[model samples]
Each structure stands twice: as C-alpha cells, then as structure tokens.
Target: KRIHIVAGIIFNSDQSEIFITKRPDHKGGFWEFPGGKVEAGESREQAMVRELEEEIGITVTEQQAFQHFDFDSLSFDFMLVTAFDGQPHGREGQQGGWVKIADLANYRFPEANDPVVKQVIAQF
Candidate 1:
C-alpha cells in the first residue's frame, strides 16, 4: 500500500527556529515535523492544513511546498508553514518543541525524514 504523508515545517518568527514533535505511539520518541496521513479525496495542501490543525491544534492558512520524498511504501510532502495562529498543542500526547535550524541534526528523526532534514539544512 502507498501511504501519503503531509507535514508542516513551522518556522518561528524570522525563520531562526523550527518546530518538531515527538511521535508518541508508532515510532515513539522519534522526532518529526508535525503532520499526518492524507485522507481520501483531499488535496495535498488541504490535507496539510487539516493535519496541522488536528495534530498541533494550529490553523495553517498558508504554506509553501518545501520538499517531496518517496520511501519504500510511503510518499511524503513537507510544506513550509509561514503563517498560522494559536500555540501548538500536541493534543495526541506527543512532546514537541522549537529547535534552531542548525541543531535539527541533533534530533532523531525517522529514516524517511532524512532527506527532508537535509533539504532543510541546505536552506540555511
């Protein structure tokens, strides 16, 4: 089965920081940009906004495409969320925090996120 994953790269004001969350269940403790699977019939952008709101409790009205990568059974799309409202509340019990872009490498992300992380580093 092919899985579609949508994620948001939420940057703090002025872009010096990025937000990431810990996976509480499946991968449990692995760090990742917040997002979830795209549901049937939803566009990529639509899925992104919905997932951000559902996962982080933040409403993202806009985003720019950042990176797209394909793993063995999954396709991932990372979007740069430049604008949003409300504080991030990982309602699903996932722990999360802001990390400086330069320090992202220190976090243990899933293997699929490796390419996305590299692309993020390249931008800085």
Candidate 2:
C-alpha cells in the first residue's frame, strides 16, 4: 500500500506566500511543506491539522483540500491553509521560511513535491 502522507500548503494572511521547511540533516535537509504521515483511523483533514500543529506551531482554523499526488511509496494529500491561529514556528528544529509564490521555482523540493510546487505556482 502507498504510504499515506499529508502536507499543509500554509499561506500568509494575503495568500501571497507559502510556508516551507527544510528537514534536519539526517533527512537530507530538503525543502518541503510542513506535514507528516497520516496514521491509522485518522481522516485526511484530521491528520493535516495535527501534522501542521506538530510540524509548525499553528492551529488550523480554515483550510481547503487542494490536490493529491502519488509518489514512490507515498500518497500525498495537499491542504491549503487559508486561516490559522498562532505564528508558525519550526517545531521540529528545522529551518523554516515563507517563500513568495513567484519565487517557488528557485527553492529545492523533494522529487514527489514537484507537482505540488507547480500546482501552487500555476494556480496563482
């Protein structure tokens, strides 16, 4: 079975920027959305909210399901976070930053995240 995963495409108040994080050294330190695996008995929405809170210090208040793509051994569920409470912090001790949508092309992402990158870039 494909490993189920979730990602939070968190944007700023104006939706002009997107949130991303670099994994710790052990994980190759590549940039990607702040989210993680979906556990058993958890819905995509539930997992997304929890993953975002765990990966980045934010409680999602409003979000919309955006897209889904399958990559080697992973099913990525993408969520667009429009509203959330609290400022985002890199809770996992990783490098975190906000990148403007137009500038997304310059950042490096995991191979699986290519579609996601294009989705956000092309959508807006």
Q: After superposition, how far is residue 39 of candidate 1 from its true place, in Å?
A: 1.1
Candidate 1 accuracy as lDDT: 0.86
- Against the hidden reference, what TM-scores do the models get? 0.90, 0.93
Give the candidate number with the greatest lDDT: 2
Model 1, runs deviating above 4 Å: 25-28
Cα RMSD for predicted model 1 = 1.5
For each candidate in the order shown, give its overall lDDT on alpha carbons. 0.86, 0.88
Model 2: residues with Cα > 4 Å off, grouped in runs: none
Looking at model 1, the pairs that clash are: none
Q: Tell me the tens digit of each residue's lDDT in model 1 across 11-68.
A: 8778878889886676455888898889899999999998888888888866999989
TM-score of candidate 2 versus the correct structure, residues matched by position:
0.93
For residues 25-73, what per-residue lDDT tens digits would candidate 2 score against the true structure?
A: 7746589988888889899899999988888999999999899887657
